[PDB]
């Protein structure tokens, strides 16, 4: 039993070439999971930028275990768009729950 | 990149005691699971034992509950299958796999443990 | 336990063929279902995950469909080096468990 994973915040809004940060809160139950981080696409479609445990996207793992800062380095104005993560249990029931997704908005200098 | 080495199959009498070791390279080790499947003799490929990355989950199949153990040594990038009082039917080729995911990406090329009187 | 069985369990296919390998789940896994091939002596490898994915470095001729209990493993203009063992594996719970093999041979 376990909910969702939250992406924060709702909003991000970074200037163009510094670093965005989101956090993804995940409640570990056991250290058998995988944490990945999505960029959706305007065409509905999913791409993985990086993945817990591991270029430009970086998660890195808070020492409460729960919080996971996820990274864009460097961001361009392409990078503006639609984020979420999802965790994975991997043992003894395999299982992926998806956050609500979140915006990034990356301006120009 | 990714090597999985194998060793320790030997033959061993029935009820004894052994311990195979696989060790990695090629990735971060502690960064994955890890996980042991067998294939007997002309068989198909049996689940074993799994361990999470940092070794505080293991899992196993019923067949060897209460007498195989699965442990790691991230220092060394060493995984162990430790098999106590073996029977007959253990006998099998055991692959070294990697498991940090849904899927077992890499696998070594086994080593042979026979039980036997 | 998950039971997991294919289908057929063996056949004989020309190269440049299309051929399909069924298996299927005794309860719904979703999407969790991998492919694996083997050849005599040696080690398997990946081929498919999450049903559909390939792995990387697989050739593209490879190709997986499914999800609930049902899934087919499809590879097209089969090639020489295709000949071999085909086994299913459930990773929606443990024990994970495999599916019995499929052999596909060479048609002389």
């Known amino acids: 039993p376990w909910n969702p994973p939250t992406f924060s915040p709702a909003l991000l809004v970074v200037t163009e070439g510094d670093n965005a940060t989101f956090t993804c809160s995940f409640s570990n139950t056991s250290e058998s999971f995988v944490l990945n981080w999505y960029r959706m696409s305007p065409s509905n479609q999913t791409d993985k930028l990086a993945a817990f445990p591991e270029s430009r996207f970086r998660v890195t793992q808070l020492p409460n275990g729960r919080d996971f800062h996820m990274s864009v380095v460097r961001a361009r104005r392409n990078d503006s768009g639609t984020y979420l993560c999802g965790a994975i249990s991997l043992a003894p029931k395999a299982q992926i729950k998806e956050s609500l997704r979140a915006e990034l908005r990356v301006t120009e200098r | 990149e990714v090597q999985l080495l194998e060793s320790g199959g030997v033959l061993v009498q029935p009820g004894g005691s052994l311990r195979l070791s696989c060790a990695a390279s090629?990735?971060?080790?502690?960064?994955?699971?890890m996980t042991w499947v067998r294939q007997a003799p002309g068989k198909g490929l049996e689940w074993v034992s799994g361990?999470?990355?940092?070794?505080?989950?293991?899992y196993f199949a019923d067949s060897v509950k209460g007498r195989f153990t699965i442990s790691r040594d991230n220092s060394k990038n060493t995984l162990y299958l430790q098999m106590n009082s073996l029977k007959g039917e253990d006998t099998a080729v055991y692959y070294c796999?990697?498991?940090?995911?849904?899927?077992?990406?890499?696998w070594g090329q086994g080593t042979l443990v026979t039980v036997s009187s | 336990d998950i039971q997991m069985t294919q289908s057929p369990s063996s056949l004989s296919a020309s190269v440049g063929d299309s051929i399909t390998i069924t298996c299927r789940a005794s309860?719904?896994?979703?999407?969790?279902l991998n492919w694996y091939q083997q050849k005599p002596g040696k080690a398997p490898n990946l081929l498919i995950y999450?049903?559909?994915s390939l792995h990387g470095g697989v050739p593209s001729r490879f190709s997986g469909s499914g999800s609930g209990t049902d899934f087919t493993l499809t590879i097209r203009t089969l090639q020489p080096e295709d000949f071999a063992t085909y086994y299913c594996?459930?990773?929606?719970?443990?024990?994970?468990?495999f599916g019995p093999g499929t052999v596909v041979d060479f048609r002389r």
């Open positions: 309860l719904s896994i979703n999407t969790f």
């Open positions: 999450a049903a559909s």
């Open positions: 090629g990735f971060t080790f502690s960064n994955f699971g």
């Open positions: 796999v990697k498991w940090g995911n849904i899927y077992f990406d890499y």
């Open positions: 361990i999470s990355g940092g070794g505080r989950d293991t």
């Open positions: 594996q459930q990773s929606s719970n443990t024990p994970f468990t």
